[PDB]
Symmetry: C3
Subunit: 320 residues, 3 copies
């Protein structure tokens, strides 16, 4: 596959991690993701340097991940800290590869490329996920399609182009009938404007803005929800979906939490998950013939994000 | 893959189609087969020209199939007839391929190859399925084997279906049509078939004929008659046995029975609608599906089949099919 | 795939075979295994010479395997003995390949390569399996890993490694010990201070026989209370294999309760937690091969490394011939 490795991707949501490691594949790389007894998240290559057993099937022993096959022990940095055989010796060849991980904005970000180039300044800005003004709920979903098809889906219903960031803004005075959603509709009564924005950040992290407000008031003074919609490639033809909603209205609604923690309700439904997986199963045919997609007006935002990913995939491929 | 695309194939039975589209793959081509408001059947490539969503998961909107992804609308010809986006424009690139589809003899025929060569006069004659002189029942079956294995099985020496237990032989070969004939005067095993025997009582003649038409469409003739009565004035059933490749290693089987006996017998309809009784026994599906899993081994070693006496008709259908494979492989 | 075809491998346990044929694949070769009316075991290529049907889905007709498609009949040599078609003629083109098979030591051995080199004298010695002095129990397992990984797993006086011709032995005596020399099942023999042994023998390609022993003080190794475990692997595909496991013990011969706990034989030929490691190692093969990733060997690996490289040398010899 052709992946963009020198970039931050979400590998998990913080609640998924524990002292029991989680095995998850990121850009065709099996990682063992666990949280150390002092709370710091580690990401080790899920292939023991000895005879390749899966570290993610082990447990922590004195805060060290102990391989379930023969008991080599590893720290968050990948250094072998205990060898229970023979002279107990730990040459450098017993170290497992370690990945940069930064926990920020209720997200576990990982750098799968050159670990020396990992720069926390490049992590996309998702502060609303930790903002006490917002109520943030969400979850995880696995999808059997290449990540770019869900990037299209999400970049879909003014387009500003920046460096490693793209914005697709739509302001809707009144709409086709009423430009009010059921959750927004109960807020006020006087005539309203609505917004439907989404921001794309380098590789495949996205944040939308769904808003309704009386008359023509500050966009930020509206009743709104910011959607976390982040994709991380799993294999060339599969990916992980991290979705979440940060709402500023009816914050302490235990009922609203239920519908928004649903897979079909916050991200793509059953017919919407079926569309991307179904498109993916049609890839071999469209490629075998000369079948290229037919663009419409509503595709400008998606096409520009697609071209940014294409540039990045070619630029890294040029390196190797 | 290796298919003979310039030929007519059955893609569905009429009763499978309605205004809710059916997704079916024919010779590695995903089709959406649906019936328009006036009942006329359309056959579109199941890949929307926009972002490749499956049209078969859509519905009709004012009689037009609307893609469930972004709402483009198509007519029976694949023409884009509504664009709900932007200036609404409908350039030619928003057309989806349409395949020649002809509903005839209670079968839904499709031409999966070069549409310029699709000639409805070439569709094999399965008239007995609409002949009010006959009672016609049948159904559908899917099998995990290359279709030629089920064509071999059906062209096999005096081999009938389970519900059909019991001059001599003759194989006539023509252009894209083969007939393998058997007349059994009086017999030695049995001349009355279990389902037939309730016709008359005195000693009889028996027939077991089968017709093959270009690429995998077959119609057999299982017959019983007293003494020496006209072959066509006999008690008989015309069996519809049509195979359509799905993938290189799987296929669709459309089986049917056109009988002139027990026309108003619903008990008889039940068994003849049975896929193991009429088309393929469970032990035969296991053999053919098992042979398919052996294809990689026999090809990797040099293993060619050793033919017997009971194989004359099938080997000829096999060689006719192969020539057609060559005609297409040469063109491109 | 790269297999060692000029070698004996177990294809089954005798109780798996009967007059009902068994389909099993050995080194990418589909076999039909059945036992003839006189008890003699035959091994035919599971591909009928007519139209490639599974012979293994057939039945015996007068001791001859009858193909379930069209009824051809085969004897133990693969010879077609009945053709129910036409003039009944049976040209040689209707014979199916037959494989050398030798039933020995309650094992079904097969030579999947060149039949001209098949020498029953090269079958490894597993006599304890038929020794009336021993009580033998075991079974079968299929595992989704290349067989070398379960040879690695199993190859893992103090610890001494003996190397012979097509034979490697890894011996361990634990004199008295410091952790424990008493095993849970063994402890109910003697009680005053004890020695323990854990040896394992590997014979060419992938047949292994271990020795688990416990005995008081310093008594003869052959006079200990012990079990000789059968651990034989046979490749199925590039990435799957058959596991034949067994226990031949000299203690509690007539104990049917004892038969039960050793038939929970996850303990010697680890097959539940141990199936999980090798299948997981196998699923990582594409990554470790795609990068230049080689295993880092330790002190506990001398036996495994020598057996692995002998398996490797034999693979090259055959790839070299062709
Ligand atoms: S083999 Fe994984 S730690 Fe010894
Ligand atoms: S795929 Fe976009 S309109 Fe059908
Ligand atoms: S395939 Fe075995 S006899 Fe026809």
């Amino acid at each position: 596959a052709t992946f963009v490795r020198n970039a931050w991707y979400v590998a998990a949501l913080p609640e998924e991690l524990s002292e029991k490691p989680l095995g998850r594949t990121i850009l065709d790389t099996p990682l063992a993701l666990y949280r150390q007894p002092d709370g710091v998240v580690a990401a080790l290559l899920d292939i023991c340097p000895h005879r390749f057993a899966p570290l993610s099937d082990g447990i922590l022993v004195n805060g060290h991940l102990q391989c379930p096959y023969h008991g080599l022990e590893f720290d968050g940095g990948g250094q072998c800290v205990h060898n229970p055989h023979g002279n107990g010796a730990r040459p450098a060849s017993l170290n497992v590869r370690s990945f940069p991980v930064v926990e920020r904005d209720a997200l576990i970000w990982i750098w799968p490329g050159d670990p020396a180039l990992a720069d926390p300044g490049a992590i996309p800005d998702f502060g609303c996920r930790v903002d006490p003004a917002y109520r943030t709920v969400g979850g995880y979903g696995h999808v059997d399609c290449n990540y770019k098809l869900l990037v299209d889906n999400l970049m879909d219903l003014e387009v500003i182009v920046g460096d490693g960031e793209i914005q697709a803004l739509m302001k809707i005075p009144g709409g086709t009938p009423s430009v009010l959603m059921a959750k927004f509709l109960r807020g006020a009564n006087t005539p309203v404007d609505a917004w439907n924005d989404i921001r794309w950040n380098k590789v495949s992290a996205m944040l939308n803005f769904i808003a309704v407000a009386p008359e023509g008031t500050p966009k930020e003074q509206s009743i709104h929800s910011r959607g976390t919609h982040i994709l991380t490639p799993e294999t060339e033809a599969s990916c992980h979906y991290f979705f979440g909603s940060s709402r500023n209205f009816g914050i302490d609604d235990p009922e609203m939490d239920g519908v928004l923690r649903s897979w079909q309700a916050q991200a793509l439904v059953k017919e919407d998950k079926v569309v991307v997986e179904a498109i993916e199963r049609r890839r071999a045919y469209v490629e075998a013939n000369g079948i290229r997609p037919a663009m419409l007006s509503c595709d400008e935002a998606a096409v520009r994000v697609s071209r940014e990913i294409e540039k990045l995939e070619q630029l890294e491929a040029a390196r190797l």
